[PDB]
Ligand binder design. Sequence first.
Ligand SMILES: Nc1nc2c(ncn2[C@@H]2O[C@H](COP(=O)(O)OP(=O)(O)OP(=O)(O)O)[C@@H](O)[C@H]2O)c(=O)[nH]1
Ligand SMILES: [Cl-]
Ligand SMILES: [Mn+2]
Ligand SMILES: [Mn+2]
Ligand SMILES: [Mn+2]
Length: 613
Amino acid sequence: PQLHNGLDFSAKVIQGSLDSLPQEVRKFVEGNAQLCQPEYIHICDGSEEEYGRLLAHMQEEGVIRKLKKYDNCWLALTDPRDVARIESKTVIITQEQRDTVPIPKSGQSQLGRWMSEEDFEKAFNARFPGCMKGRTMYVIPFSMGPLGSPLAKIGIELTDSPYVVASMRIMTRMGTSVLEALGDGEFIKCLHSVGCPLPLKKPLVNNWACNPELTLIAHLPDRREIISFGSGYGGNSLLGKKCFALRIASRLAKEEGWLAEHMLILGITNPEGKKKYLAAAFPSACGKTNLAMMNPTLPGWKVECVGDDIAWMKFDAQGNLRAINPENGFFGVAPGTSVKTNPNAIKTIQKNTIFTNVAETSDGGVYWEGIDEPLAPGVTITSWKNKEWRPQDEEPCAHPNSRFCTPASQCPIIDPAWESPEGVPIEGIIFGGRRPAGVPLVYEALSWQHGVFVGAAMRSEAGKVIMHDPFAMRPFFGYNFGKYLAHWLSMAHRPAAKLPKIFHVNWFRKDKNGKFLWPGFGENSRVLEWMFGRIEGEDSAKLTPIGYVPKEDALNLKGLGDVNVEELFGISKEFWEKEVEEIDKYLEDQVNADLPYEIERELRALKQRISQM
Ligand SMILES: Nc1nc2c(ncn2[C@@H]2O[C@H](COP(=O)(O)OP(=O)(O)OP(=O)(O)O)[C@@H](O)[C@H]2O)c(=O)[nH]1
Ligand SMILES: [Cl-]
Ligand SMILES: [Mn+2]
Ligand SMILES: [Mn+2]
Ligand SMILES: [Mn+2]
């Protein structure tokens, strides 16, 4: 219905048809077209043709550069004001603040950022009206998880950024098949704008549209909406990556009885032909992607990658914890990636990959700190700021959190079940962070409840600062962390639930000279071997106040020899007395009235065990 001609946007559709869309999808698209006033509407089909044409268009406009040395690889350099996920501008809107974060006892909550509905309404009206003027609104239908998986969820992202379209094609399952699978079902509404309507009011920097002053990444779980404005970058703009995958999904999981977690999933096979799947939650910069595609050093062992960042997990009727990787690609940190630290990533990213904010070599290759690769004489480097750069300079050639964006199907060790709609059965969950002192290489939680406490007590080095990052989810909780703990704990009362063993690792313990005690990377297969046997029930553990650690000689150290096991597994009363005190202060303040009894009990129990050593 229409008294004039400003409500039907059919005349502006340059690919697809509004009449083809499911009724509620059409209302989403047309309502925001009316608000944002795009010049064109492009309904993405996900085809190779649309993808290649969009890439070529971005190339002609200077938005991306083709990397000549590789096969269909591309480089985007951003406005340096728009280089990362920005927590201070990431908010969750609920009626009551207590649904989004626990009310802290004394301090400010660091477990989330709540915004009232009225405040968001003002912010929204100050940003989105007319924000796509002169631009194409792309409609991205995408599936989080294998199409038709019982654990998959569907989203529709509206964006004015072709960079987002290309990246979402890699990181999600995108296109016409998703719309047909959606039918009249439920979907998450995702609205994104870089916030630079034409004609441009402010200078465009590095051909990268963004609006840093007005950047705001909002989540409305009760409306099943994600609304992001002002950033074109990564987790701010690829709304499946963190906004859907963790923040919205963790609320859905709370309501529906499953788990959405900042975890890799890997499958490990031992020399006896036995295969187990493990999940691991490490904070950013703590090596999930290295572990997920590890090249094991132990002969006869094999590791295969299901996902490197996000896990959606649900106990099935048989009681197995079944996990899917809801992503379709890897959005990995580039700096530090080398043949030594991640050879399988190096193989994956040389075709069909989009790089953002890395350096470019004069022969059309990529470069970054820690690449640990020499360049032939004559080869020169352009920094991520589009300036000539030489290794004898201070500033980095690549942004510290520059990324590659690569299809998961290309990983040479992608797991054969990485797209299985039923998911893979998780037998162990690993927590870990950067702890230069005090925390052993590996230990095993004494019970599910103790394991949940271990996840809750996770800390990690940021002068050095040791921060709290419970479950590696501190930036990503979609709801009250205290209820999230209760949700985890409630899994132990499920029907026939086969609870995975929980472990905590530390690759980063250092000696008094600051050298790593453990070589890490592929040598972490030796730690996975110990976990593997522990899941099988092997008698390879000794009890300590913090949990089980490997017996003397239980860890396979053949081929190392120069490793200080006593210091690596040293457990100091002095350190752990201070550690439990800090955990106690943290949980009391930050979780306060929503701290489950079982977690307080595990804290008291650990305090008591440490007091007796
Ligand atoms: N010493 C040591 N460092 C490691 C090991 N594994 C990974 N790293 C370091 O971890 C960093 C890479 O971590 P990231 O890619 O940022 O970790 P991530 O968990 O994948 O982070 P996100 O992609 O943001 O979720 C580099 O500094 C690596 O050197 C290890 O076993 N030992
Ligand atoms: Cl354009
Ligand atoms: Mn990663
Ligand atoms: Mn991550
Ligand atoms: Mn309980």
